[PDB]
Design an enzyme around this catalytic site. Structure first.
Site, PDB file in Angstrom:
ATOM      1  N   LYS A   1      10.031   0.992   3.018  1.00  0.00           N
ATOM      2  CA  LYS A   1       9.239   2.114   2.536  1.00  0.00           C
ATOM      3  C   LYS A   1      10.106   3.074   1.728  1.00  0.00           C
ATOM      4  CE  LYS A   1       8.015   3.217   6.662  1.00  0.00           C
ATOM      5  NZ  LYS A   1       7.483   3.881   7.891  1.00  0.00           N
TER       6      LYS A   1
ATOM      7  N   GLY B   1       0.775  -1.230   0.000  1.00  0.00           N
ATOM      8  CA  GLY B   1       0.000   0.000   0.000  1.00  0.00           C
ATOM      9  C   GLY B   1       0.809   1.284   0.000  1.00  0.00           C
TER      10      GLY B   1
ATOM     11  N   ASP C   1       1.309  12.159  17.445  1.00  0.00           N
ATOM     12  CA  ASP C   1       0.435  11.564  16.452  1.00  0.00           C
ATOM     13  C   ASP C   1       0.039  10.122  16.753  1.00  0.00           C
ATOM     14  OD1 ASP C   1      -1.034  11.874  14.045  1.00  0.00           O
ATOM     15  OD2 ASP C   1       0.521  10.764  12.959  1.00  0.00           O
TER      16      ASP C   1
ATOM     17  N   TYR D   1       5.695   9.883   1.611  1.00  0.00           N
ATOM     18  CA  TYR D   1       6.430  10.385   0.455  1.00  0.00           C
ATOM     19  C   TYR D   1       6.564   9.341  -0.648  1.00  0.00           C
ATOM     20  N   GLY D   2       6.047   8.141  -0.393  1.00  0.00           N
ATOM     21  CA  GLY D   2       6.117   7.069  -1.371  1.00  0.00           C
ATOM     22  C   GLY D   2       5.333   5.847  -0.928  1.00  0.00           C
TER      23      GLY D   2
END
Lengths: 338, 11
Positions: A45, A23, A140, A27-28
């Site tokens: 990633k 998925g 977060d 940034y990518g």
């Protein structure tokens, strides 16, 4: 030549093969891969933030923080891959361990017994204590940021939005934000993560977001709709986005007894829940007090709850300057680089 | 003691 994935380049060197798309991430996109050195399937990633000042910063943090942090409950970066020279480095691949699911996916189609919620909560707090002792905020914490494999191991990840704490701006998703922040305001106190964690617990109890809301005023009123209208010292408190005049001009809202909302939730979990989900940040329970709560007593052991070896301590430099530091940082994972 | 007490097969 370089292995492609969904028509996308994914040149990770001959150390990782058998790539499988899973998925998106930031940034990518994110892929799975077989490590030919550890004979396991790590997650990798791809990040391409060199031409973005925001991305560049969010990257450097994520790389710097994780690289220096080492805790059972804080995801670790196993390796990093980038071009031999910063001149060609147009993207970076951060290789980390591959957990089965994550708290978001699990809590969505899966149902957790009380015993699992207690263990999960503990691992979460045990790790938060480390970060919080490191003089740092995650800023977060959310279901999708808590990884886990079948063994029930939980790890906190994604520190691209983290921030260095101490006594003395475009937001995606708000379901786990404390009242004081609400609608672009970025937190500056550890107490904010507590509310988030408190929110995460609430979900593990009902499999549904405790504070949904079309917009921030709708979410805001959703909160009071549960916790009942706060005092005046609570409003006048750290609640001042100005639009707080909203709450001021609002009738009296009653509190919904946690036990009513969660008819099948253990009494201990709720008591602690209440302590975390309090409007006045100042009154929110701290991570050490929480770890010592009756609810988490079968797992509680301060000697097995380590703190950062050293607290964490200049970061608005131009991107090409961040790329420079992103190059120096990733310099350790290059072959024969001491 | 040690990292124990938990199990849940998932995706």
């Amino acid at each position: 030549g370089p292995e492609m994935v969904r028509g996308q380049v994914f040149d990770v060197g001959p150390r990782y093969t058998n790539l499988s798309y899973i998925g998106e991430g930031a940034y990518g996109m994110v892929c799975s891969a077989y490590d030919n050195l550890n004979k396991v399937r790590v997650a990798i990633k791809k990040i391409s933030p060199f031409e973005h000042q925001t991305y560049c910063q969010r990257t450097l943090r994520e790389i710097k923080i994780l690289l220096r942090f080492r805790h059972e409950n804080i995801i670790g970066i196993n390796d990093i891959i980038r071009a031999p020279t910063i001149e060609q480095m147009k993207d970076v691949y951060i290789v980390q361990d591959l957990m089965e699911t994550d708290l978001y996916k699990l809590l969505k189609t899966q149902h957790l017994s009380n015993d699992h919620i207690c263990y999960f909560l503990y691992q979460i707090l045990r790790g938060l204590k480390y970060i919080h002792s490191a003089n740092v905020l995650h800023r977060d914490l959310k279901p999708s940021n808590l990884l886990l494999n079948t063994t029930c191991d939980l790890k906190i990840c994604d520190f691209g939005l983290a921030r260095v704490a101490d006594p003395d701006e475009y937001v995606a998703t708000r379901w786990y934000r404390a009242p004081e922040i609400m609608l672009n305001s970025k937190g500056y106190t550890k107490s904010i993560d507590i509310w988030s964690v408190g929110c995460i617990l609430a979900e593990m109890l009902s499999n549904r977001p405790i504070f949904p809301g079309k917009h921030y005023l709708d979410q805001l009123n959703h909160i009071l709709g549960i916790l009942g209208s706060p005092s005046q010292e609570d409003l006048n408190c750290i609640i001042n986005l100005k639009a707080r005049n909203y709450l001021l001009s609002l009738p009296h809202k009653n509190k919904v007894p946690w036990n009513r909302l969660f008819p099948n939730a253990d009494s201990k979990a709720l008591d602690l829940l209440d302590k975390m989900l309090t409007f006045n940040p100042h009154k929110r329970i701290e991570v050490e007090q929480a770890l010592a709560h009756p609810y988490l007593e079968q797992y509680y052991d301060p000697s097995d709850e380590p703190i950062a070896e050293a607290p964490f301590k200049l970061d608005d430099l131009p991107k090409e300057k961040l790329k420079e530091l992103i190059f120096e940082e990733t310099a350790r994972f290059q072959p024969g680089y001491r | 003691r040690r990292l124990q007490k938990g199990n849940l097969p998932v995706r």
